[PDB]
Amino acid sequence: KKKRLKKRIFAAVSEGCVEELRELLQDLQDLCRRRRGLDVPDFLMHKLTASDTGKTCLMKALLNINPNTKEIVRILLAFAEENDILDRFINAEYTEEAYEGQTALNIAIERRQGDITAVLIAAGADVNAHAKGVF
Amino acid sequence: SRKFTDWAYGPVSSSLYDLTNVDTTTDNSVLEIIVYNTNIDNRHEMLTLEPLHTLLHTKWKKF
Amino acid sequence: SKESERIWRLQRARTILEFEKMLPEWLRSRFRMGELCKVADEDFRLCLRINEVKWTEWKTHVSFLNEDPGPIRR
Distance between CA atoms of C72 and A115, rounded to whole angstroms? Predict the structure, then answer.
C-alpha cells in the first residue's frame, strides 16, 4: 500500500522523539521479514536513505537538535546492531556530490555535540573521511 | 522575526533579512523616507544598518 | 575626515533612488529573491536577502532552514 515509512521517520526524528519512532521501529521489522531470506542489508539501507541526497536516518536526526537527542541515537544504534549492518551505516558518506563525503561523524563535531560524539566513536566509526565538494 | 539563519556549517552563517516594507517596491518605504527627509541630524549613521547597507550597495552594483 | 565617509554615502543615496524614479519599466533587474519561505505551513512569501557573517561566540545552531548548502541545491 506504499506506506510512508521514509517520510514518517524524518518527521519523527525532528520533534516526535521517543514514542512515535519506536512504534515505527517495530513496523520495520515486520516489513523486512516477509521476503524470508532476501538481500537483507540492501533492502533495509534503501528504506532508511533517500535516493538523491543519500541522507541517512541518523544524519537527519543529527542536523536539527533537540534536548532528547541522546536518546534518538541509542535507539537508532541498537536497531542497526540487531541487523548487524551498523558499520556500513555509521560510515555512510553523503553522495550527492554537493558536499560529498561528509559523514554522520562530521555532523557531530560541527554541531558541537560532544556527548553523542563519544557514543558515535564507541560504535567504531572512521575518523578519517575526506570531504570534497562544492565548498 | 525579521531575520533568519539559513545554515551554519561552522562559524560561517548566512544572513537573511525580511525586506517587506524596506526596499522601494511599494509607496513610501523606509529607504525613500530615510533619504528624502530633512530635519534629522542622524541620517549618515542610519544607512550603516544591514538591510539598508548591502542592499543599497547591491542596487548600485548591478545597474 | 572619518565622518565624510558617512555623509557622502548619503549623497550616493540621493542618486540611487532618483534612478529608481526615473525608470518606470517592469524592472527586469530583480534586486531580491522572490517568494522564498521564511517559516510556515502555508505562508511562503515576503521576498528576501542573503549576506554572510563571521566568527566567535559559537553555539549549537538550532533554527536553520535548509540542509546546510551554500549555493542552491542542484
Answer: 32
Closest CA to A98 of B12, B7, C73, B8: C73
- Expressed in Å, this structure's resolution amounts to 4.5
Elucidation technique: cryo-EM
User: Locate cell 572619518: which residue?
Assistant: C2
Pair A85, A41: CB distance under 8 Å: yes
Give the minimum alpha-carbon distance from A109 to chain B in angstroms, rounded to a whole number: 10
Q: Could you give the CA distance from residue C74 to residue C60 in angstroms, rounded to a whole number?
A: 27
Which ranges of chain C would DSSP assign to H, the alpha helix?
4-22
Q: Count the helices and strands in chain C (H runs, E runs).
A: 1, 1
Answer yes or no: are the C-beta atoms of A47 and A41 closer than 8 Å: no
Closest residue by Cα to residue B62 from C32, C36, C11: C32
C-alpha span between A9 and A24 (Å, rounded): 7
The three cell numbers of residue C35 are 517568494
**DSSP H/E element including B51:** helix B50-62
Of the candidates A88, A110, A94, A12, the residue with the CA atom closest to the CA atom of residue A53: A94
Cell, residue A41: 542489508
A134 reaches B (C-beta below 8 A): no
First CA to last CA distance, chain C = 48
CA distance linking residue C49 with residue A80, whole number of Å:
42
Phi-psi region of A31 (alpha: psi -120 to 50; beta: other; left: phi over 0): alpha
A19 and chain B in contact, CB less than 8 A: no
